[PDB]
Amino acid sequence: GMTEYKLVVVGARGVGKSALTIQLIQNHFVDEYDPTIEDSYRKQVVIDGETSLLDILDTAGQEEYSAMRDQYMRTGEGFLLVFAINNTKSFEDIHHYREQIKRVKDSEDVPMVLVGNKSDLPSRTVDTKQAQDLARSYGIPFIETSAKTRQGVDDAFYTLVREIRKHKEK
Ligand SMILES: *[C@@H](C)[C@](*)(O)C(=O)N1CCN(c2nc(OCC34CCCN3CCC4)nc3c(F)c(-c4cccc5cccc(Cl)c45)ncc23)C[C@@H]1CC#N
Ligand SMILES: Nc1nc2c(ncn2[C@@H]2O[C@H](COP(=O)(O)OP(=O)(O)O)[C@@H](O)[C@H]2O)c(=O)[nH]1
Ligand SMILES: [Mg+2]
């Protein structure tokens, strides 16, 4: 049979949320994608032998806090926390995103993966060690990705799926 997973991708504008999602869904790199479009994308994949339907909310929009937005976000079973390794502000923003996740899920135990995107770029500003300690302090996996070269893209989403499965066992 099959299993469905609702994934939500969050992080600062321009970190590559849409590029990452389109790599997962369409298996190529799309370097210009309207920064204002928020939508959900599907894709069925086999992950550890199990047919997995991924429903991925690529976030955009305004920074508004309302019960409507909380309702969309609360539907997510797991979250990708995305920063760009060449943008320190996007990395500093991660703490805020995780807090809003914890708020709408009413739990500190929410499946999440920390994703340092743009690993293909030469002028890294966020050290891999800084990111690993942030993920360790959250108790979550960390992966560096490049939506440009597709490095780590599959594993980032599949690791999040594996984190959800565990959480569902409780
Ligand atoms: C680009 C800049 C354009 O405006 C855009 O597409 N954005 C920016 C606004 N969005 C947004 N931003 C933040 O954080 C911005 C930050 C970080 C520290 C706090 N502030 C002020 C300026 C920098 N946070 C957001 C949200 F938290 C949500 C949201 C709202 C309610 C509930 C939940 C629950 C879980 C997760 C999230 Cl993301 C929730 N929405 C937007 C938002 C939107 C977009 C960037 C993104 N993603
Ligand atoms: N070099 C490089 N550029 C990227 C990568 N991912 C996204 N980009 C670029 O970063 C910008 C923002 O990407 P986008 O997918 O729109 O980010 P979003 O706002 O988080 O949806 C665009 O110019 C993309 O071409 C990556 O892994 N490597
Ligand atoms: Mg986008």
Author numbering: 0 to 169
Provide excerpts from the study.
KRAS mutations are one of the most common oncogenic drivers in human cancer. One of such hot spot mutations, KRAS p.G12R, is found in 17% of pancreatic ductal adenocarcinoma (PDAC) patients, accounting for more than 9,000 new cancer patients per year in the U.S. alone. Here we report the discovery of covalent chemical ligands for the common oncogenic mutant K-Ras(G12R). These ligands bind in the Switch II pocket and irreversibly react with the mutant arginine residue.
